[PDB]
Amino acid sequence: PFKVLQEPTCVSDYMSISTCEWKMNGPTQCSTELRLLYQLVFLLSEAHTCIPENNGGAGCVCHLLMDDVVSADQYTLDLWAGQQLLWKGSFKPSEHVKPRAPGNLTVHTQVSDTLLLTWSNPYPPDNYLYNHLTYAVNIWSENDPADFRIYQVTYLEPSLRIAASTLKSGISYRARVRAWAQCYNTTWSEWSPSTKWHN
Amino acid sequence: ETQPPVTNLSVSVENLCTVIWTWNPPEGASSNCSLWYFSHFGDKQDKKIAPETRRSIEVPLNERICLQVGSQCSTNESEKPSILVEKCISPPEGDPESAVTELQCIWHNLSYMKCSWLPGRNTSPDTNYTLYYWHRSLEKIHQCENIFREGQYFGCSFDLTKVQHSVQIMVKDNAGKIKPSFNIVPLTSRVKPDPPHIKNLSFHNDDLYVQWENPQNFISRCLFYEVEVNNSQTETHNVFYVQEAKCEENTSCFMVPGVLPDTLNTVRIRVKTNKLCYEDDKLWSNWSQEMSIGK
Amino acid sequence: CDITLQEIIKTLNSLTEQKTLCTELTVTDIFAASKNTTEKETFCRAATVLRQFYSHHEKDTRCLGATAQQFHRHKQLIRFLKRLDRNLWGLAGLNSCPVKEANQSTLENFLERLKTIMREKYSKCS
Ligand SMILES: *[C@@H]1O[C@H](CO)[C@@H](O)[C@H](O)[C@H]1NC(C)=O
Numbered sequence: 001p002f003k004v005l006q007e008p009t010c011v012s013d014y015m016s017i018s019t020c021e022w023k024m025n026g027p028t029q030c031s032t033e034l035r036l037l038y039q040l041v042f043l044l045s046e047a048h049t050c051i052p053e054n055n056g057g058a059g060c061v062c063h064l065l066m067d068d069v070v071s072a073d074q075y076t077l078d079l080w081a082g083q084q085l086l087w088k089g090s091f092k093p094s095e096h097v098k099p100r101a102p103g104n105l106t107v108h109t110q111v112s113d114t115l116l117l118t119w120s121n122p123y124p125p126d127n128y129l130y131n132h133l134t135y136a137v138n139i140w141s142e143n144d145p146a147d148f149r150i151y152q153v154t155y156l157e158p159s160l161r162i163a164a165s166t167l168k169s170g171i172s173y174r175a176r177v178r179a180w181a182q183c184y185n186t187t188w189s190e191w192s193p194s195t196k197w198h199n
Numbered sequence: 200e201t202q203p204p205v206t207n208l209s210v211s212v213e214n215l216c217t218v219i220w221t222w223n224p225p226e227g228a229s230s231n232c233s234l235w236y237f238s239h240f241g242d243k244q245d246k247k248i249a250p251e252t253r254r255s256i257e258v259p260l261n262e263r264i265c266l267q268v269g270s271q272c273s274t275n276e277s278e279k280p281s282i283l284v285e286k287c288i289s290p291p292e293g294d295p296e297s298a299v300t301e302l303q304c305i306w307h308n309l310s311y312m313k314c315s316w317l318p319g320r321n322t323s324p325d326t327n328y329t330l331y332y333w334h335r336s337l338e339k340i341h342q343c344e345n346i347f348r349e350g351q352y353f354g355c356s357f358d359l360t361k362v363q364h365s366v367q368i369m370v371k372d373n374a375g376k377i378k379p380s381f382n383i384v385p386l387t388s389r390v391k392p393d394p395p396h397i398k399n400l401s402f403h404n405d406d407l408y409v410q411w412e413n414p415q416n417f418i419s420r421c422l423f424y425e426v427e428v429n430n431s432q433t434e435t436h437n438v439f440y441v442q443e444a445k446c447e448e449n450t451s452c453f454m455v456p457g458v459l460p461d462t463l464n465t466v467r468i469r470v471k472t473n474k475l476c477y478e479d480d481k482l483w484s485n486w487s488q489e490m491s492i493g494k
Numbered sequence: 495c496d497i498t499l500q501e502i503i504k505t506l507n508s509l510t511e512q513k514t515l516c517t518e519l520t521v522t523d524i525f526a527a528s529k530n531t532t533e534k535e536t537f538c539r540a541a542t543v544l545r546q547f548y549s550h551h552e553k554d555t556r557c558l559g560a561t562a563q564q565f566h567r568h569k570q571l572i573r574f575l576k577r578l579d580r581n582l583w584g585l586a587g588l589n590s591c592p593v594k595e596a597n598q599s600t601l602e603n604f605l606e607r608l609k610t611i612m613r614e615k616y617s618k619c620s
């Protein structure tokens with residue numbers, strides 16, 4: 001007997017994969033018990049099926065494959081089990097955006113007492129987000145959790161340059177970053193893969 | 200399945216380089232035909248279909264241009280008449296070698312236009328250049344009066360304010376010997392703004408805040424900025440590319456990450472028009488005056 | 495004025511910088527033959543107009559041959575046109591917009607006309 005517990009939620013990476021998550025009442029084999037049907041609120045556009053994946057014994061998740069999305073796009077969501085329509089709703093991607101966490105974070109040692117950290121923008125130059133991404137670097141000390149620092153980056157270049165003077169030598173430091181787009185009122189991305197270095 | 204060609208195609212010029220074609224309907228064409236004319240430049244290059252028996256365009260007259268005009272009974276892929284009449288207009292008398300080169304213009308701070316050029320390969324050492332300009336607003340063609348000489352360049356400038364737009368430019372001689380030189384300036388392009396003014400620099404926990412006042416005649420929303428930050432001790436010349444500089448009238452804010460108040464930072468800021476409001480964004484303003492923080 | 499404005503402008507700026515061969519074809523000059531119409535209609539008509547184009551030419555070998563680069567350069571064109579359609583369309587909020595089918599002029603010309611208008615709106619709003 002099927003029953004959704006908490007109403008499904010979706011975020012968009014405004015590129016392709018706009019993942020959706022929800023929890024059932026009991027432990028379901030998401031992959032075989034339920035199907036996820038999404039469709040673009042536009043004329044001539046057909047419905048789409050999705051094979052959900054397990055997210056906790058009861059929790060299900062599907063990644064809605066979307067070729068290309070614009071601000072105007074409104075999607076229809078229908079969650080099927082087989083033939084019994086459980087729940088259905090709508091979802092406008094642009095409204096709820098979770099930017100794709102940035103990667104390739106690398107630390108470099110320039111001369112002149114400056115430490116250069118460089119990462120790459122996860123999006124292509126023709127993505128509607130490429131130009132609105134403002135990162136937020138996070139540097140911290142291992143056994144000194146009070147020795148945490150967070151630097152905001154608003155410029156386009158995906159690179160921050162702090163001063164060595166703000167770092168204790170012979171001590172381990174880690175850096176992770178996350179991007180978000182203020183113009184779309186998005187939420188933070190995931191943190192990037194952490195990095196380690198000592199002075 | 201084919202209508203007769205158009206009649207007595209003529210071509211005249213108005214303003215400085217607004218070429219205007221004119222023609223008459225065909226003779227004894229179908230009565231059951233709703234009458235439409237088809238036209239394009241040489242090489243079927245930029246086509247158009249309309250009922251009007253005329254088509255005018257704003258085009259430089261440095262090269263020769265031809266319009267081919269045809270006849271139609273619909274707007275679709277019909278049996279198109281297949282009899283294209285056509286007329287050309289050739290550039291003014293002077294020889295190509297005498298016409299001036301490198302004619303360029305820049306709309307400075309949306310206030311005046313500054314245009315310059317160099318003499319032609321084969322120009323008499325006595326020829327006097329005159330520059331003419333026209334746009335929709337003007338009463339009649341205007342003559343540019345504030346001339347200047349710089350290095351080997353000749354140039355004029357004229358007041359041009361603000362309240363599709365493009366200015367018609369022509370430079371010829373006062374003896375009618377050399378070949379005229381034309382130029383249509385996009386005018387949503389080629390805009391160099393005046394440099395911004397840094398209001399203040401506030402440090403707050405190693406986070407550097409930069410406020411500056413943008414050039415009087417512009418909207419922040421329509422500018423893109425580049426912030427330069429030089430450091431005397433670390434010898435670190437930095438420059439940031441910024442598109443959204445908003446604060447929490449006329450002022451804009453940006454924050455420099457990872458800098459310390461125990462080192463002198465010299466700041467400058469230059470600005471350019473953006474592709475969101477303007478046709479092109481190549482012409483950076485000058486650098487603002489400097490403001491440093493504290494060693 | 496929300497982001498849709500910027501997305502539109504962005505796509506147009508991308509379309510107008512890369513001159514194709516399918517750009518030679520024509521469409522209704524809703525702009526040059528402008529009337530007492532309101533903004534909503536305009537964006538709508540543009541959406542309607544733009545629809546017709548790729549609705550026909552997405553499966554048009556005449557635009558598609560030559561090189562596999564142009565093949566994709568055409569794919570882009572259809573892609574960006576589609577994106578432009580949906581935005582304008584949603585920006586209009588109208589069920590249908592009867593296009594009078596009056597004058598014709600190249601898509602290139604059309605795109606330029608529109609590019610300009612969108613740019614104006616973006617700068618005057620708040
Ligand atoms: C860095 O990671 C990105 C994905 O975030 C990848 O697309 C790119 O190829 C990587 N860098 C290079 C140029 O190797």
Ligand SMILES: *[C@@H]1O[C@H](CO)[C@@H](O)[C@H](O)[C@H]1NC(C)=O
Binds near residue numbers: 185
């Ligand atoms: C951004 O989105 C959040 C959603 O919780 C909302 O609370 C907030 O008001 C939004 N910010 C604005 C004012 O755009």
